[PDB]
């Protein structure tokens, strides 16, 4: 009936200017406010800005007018430039369709969103280090810490997705040192330590980085 | 600067119930209030419109109302598919501003955590840094307090924690803290201990080791 | 003999949308074309009569209303408009044979905490008759539960403020707007 496609680059170094830009097909684009929220990483929403057929602009006072909101009324789009962005800027921005002009009541259609992620840190495959069941028990648990990666996500099965069962992978961390930290846990038999072997599948596709990595009680 | 307080910050539930939740408006708003539902990876779509409007392809058991200044998100007969964050968005006023969110979670029995420790790695210390990972499995209760003990030197300020959802079969969370540490201090101690304070352990469980054993 | 038209533009006070400010002229001489090529004013468009002072120095009783609005409202001071203004505050007949001028007052009447002076009819339980003025401060029942004189959950208090902060964007700043009506008695 009504959709929102946006798009724009979401990788950025601090400093540089976010760009995005958002395509109404539908609705008529005269008759609504156009606006942009945010989302931080687990921060709740935040309303950035948002402009009118006639290119009003109404900004939120926390952008240090770092905020420009563009319109162009021959392709009913609407952009966004963010400019001085720092990783603080780190959120998903989605567009949607604004207050209509009558009653004043939107936010009706939002666009797919875009995650943008403001970092000075470069590419970088995970190291896989092992996390042992110790000499004690019923049920034991082992599994894998996937440290030093940027940027996310990462994927990780056991025994090439022969198991999954009391698996548990933790989302990703965001360390002190710009590099992201994650950690695979899985419950199993203490009576299968000798037996059934244990192997962590990790996978980063922005290095081209796999590690497979047995795990195993440490000998005393 | 309006602030919006949304009470509470979490609450669990089962299906079948009723439930309410309130946004508290710092000025009057009159009639522009807004309620969106938010799940993990999906699009936010909207609710409530002006207070107490239902938006078109919202089922009926979905209610709204206001005063001006207090508002209420109703629920009546709860299904699977309303457990996720709510948020409530004034526009009475420029800058329009926000809730803190609502987080509505399954309701189930209390579950003492499984807790397990696990030093770090001879060939992560060959690099250099040590990492100690302390891990809550099958509980319930969300609160939870894990406490770091180096030679009973109560740790903070260096470690980090995460979480998992609510599993899609028993409705735990389990938690992963990680201390991190650099070779140097972490050969300085002895004893590494993970305390862990939960509602349904009658007293504080701690699993411990000693480095090189 | 000049009319009175400094005391409405200029005045220093204007009148809340929902109680508008009507001024009744007569022993009326005005240049209508001054006003018409004036820069001062962003919205003038004349409905029906069109800019011409050659008409019998002044009508039978030429009606002046004034009030504030915001920018995004200017549209619907006009005949056959749909929205909040024109249902519940300030209605214009089909049949309207007169002038809207409108400008920018953000220098006037926006405050940098927010001027809450100005405010607006935001519940009615019917749409407004032309030229009809509603004062009433009787409490809406939204919902199906009455309200009985008192605030309350979908028990609202009709009238709301205007925010009118000097950073707001032009859509959200305040515009004073001016109605002119021409009725034909006598003429003056
Ligand atoms: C509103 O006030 C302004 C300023 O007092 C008036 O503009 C003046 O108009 C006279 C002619 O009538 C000019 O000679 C002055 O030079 C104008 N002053 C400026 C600075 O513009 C205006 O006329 C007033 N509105 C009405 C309807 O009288």
């Known amino acids: 009936e009504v959709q929102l496609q946006q798009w724009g680059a979401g990788l950025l170094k601090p400093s540089e200017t976010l760009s995005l830009t958002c395509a109404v097909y539908?609705?008529?684009?005269?008759?609504?406010?156009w606006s942009w929220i945010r989302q931080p990483p687990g921060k709740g929403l935040e309303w950035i800005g948002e402009?009118?057929?006639?290119?009003?602009?109404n900004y939120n006072p926390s952008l240090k007018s770092r905020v420009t909101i563009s319109v162009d009324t021959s392709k009913n789009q609407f952009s966004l430039k963010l400019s001085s962005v720092t990783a603080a800027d780190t959120a998903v921005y989605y567009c949607?369709?604004?207050?209509?002009?009558?009653?004043?009541?939107?936010?009706?259609?939002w666009g797919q969103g875009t995650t943008v992620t403001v970092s000075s840190a470069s590419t970088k495959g995970p190291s896989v280090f092992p996390l042992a069941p110790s000499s004690k028990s019923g049920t034991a648990a082992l599994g894998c810490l996937v440290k030093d990666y940027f940027p996310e996500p990462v994927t990780v099965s056991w025994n090439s997705g022969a198991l999954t069962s009391g698996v548990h992978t933790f989302p990703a961390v965001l360390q002190s040192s710009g590099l992201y930290s994650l950690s695979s846990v899985v419950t199993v038999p203490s009576s299968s330590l000798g037996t059934q072997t244990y192997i962590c599948n990790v996978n980063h596709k922005p290095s081209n980085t796999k590690v497979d990595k047995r795990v195993e009680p440490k000998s005393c | 600067a309006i602030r919006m307080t949304q009470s509470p910050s979490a609450m669990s539930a089962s299906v079948g119930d009723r439930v309410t939740v309130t946004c508290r408006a710092s000025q009057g708003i009159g009639n522009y209030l807004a309620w969106f539902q938010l799940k993990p990876g999906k699009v936010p779509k909207r609710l409530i419109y002006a207070a107490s409007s239902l938006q078109s392809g919202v089922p009926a058991r979905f209610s709204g109302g206001g005063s001006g200044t207090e508002f209420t998100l109703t629920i009546s007969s709860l299904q699977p598919e309303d457990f996720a964050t709510y948020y409530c968005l004034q526009h009475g006023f420029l800058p329009w501003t926000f809730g803190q969110g609502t987080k509505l979670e399954i309701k189930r029995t209390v579950a003492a955590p499984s807790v397990f420790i696990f030093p770090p790695s001879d060939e992560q210390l060959k690099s250099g840094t040590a990492s100690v990972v302390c891990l809550l499995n099958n509980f319930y209760p969300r609160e939870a307090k894990v406490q770091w003990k180096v030679d009973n030197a109560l740790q903070s300020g260096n470690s980090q924690e995460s979480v998992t959802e609510q599993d899609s079969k028993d409705s735990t969370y389990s938690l992963s803290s990680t201390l991190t540490l650099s070779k140097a201090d972490y050969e300085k101690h002895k004893v590494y201990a993970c305390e862990v304070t939960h509602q349904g352990l009658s007293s504080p469980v701690t699993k411990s080791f000693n480095r090189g054993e | 003999n000049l009319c009175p038209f400094g005391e409405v533009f200029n005045a220093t006070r204007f009148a809340s949308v929902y109680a508008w400010n009507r001024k009744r002229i007569s022993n009326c001489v005005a240049d209508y074309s001054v006003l018409y090529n004036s820069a001062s004013f962003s919205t003038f468009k004349c409905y029906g009569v069109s800019p011409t002072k050659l008409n019998d120095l002044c009508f039978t009783n030429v009606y002046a209303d004034s009030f504030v609005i915001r920018g995004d409202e200017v549209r619907q001071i006009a005949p056959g408009q749909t929205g909040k203004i024109a249902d519940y505050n300030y209605k214009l007949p089909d049949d309207f044979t007169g002038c809207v001028i409108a400008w920018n007052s953000n220098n006037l009447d926006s405050k940098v905490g927010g001027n809450y002076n100005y405010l607006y009819r935001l519940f009615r339980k019917s749409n407004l008759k032309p030229f009809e003025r509603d004062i009433s401060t009787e409490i809406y029942q939204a919902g199906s539960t009455p309200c009985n004189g008192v605030e309350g959950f979908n028990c609202y208090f009709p009238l709301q403020s205007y925010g009118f902060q000097p950073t707001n964007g032009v859509g959200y700043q305040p515009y004073r707007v001016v109605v002119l009506s021409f009725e034909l008695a006598t003429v003056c």
């Open positions: 949607a369709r604004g207050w209509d002009l009558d009653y004043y009541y939107g936010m009706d259609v």
């Open positions: 539908g609705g008529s684009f005269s008759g609504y406010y």
């Open positions: 402009i009118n057929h006639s290119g009003s602009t």
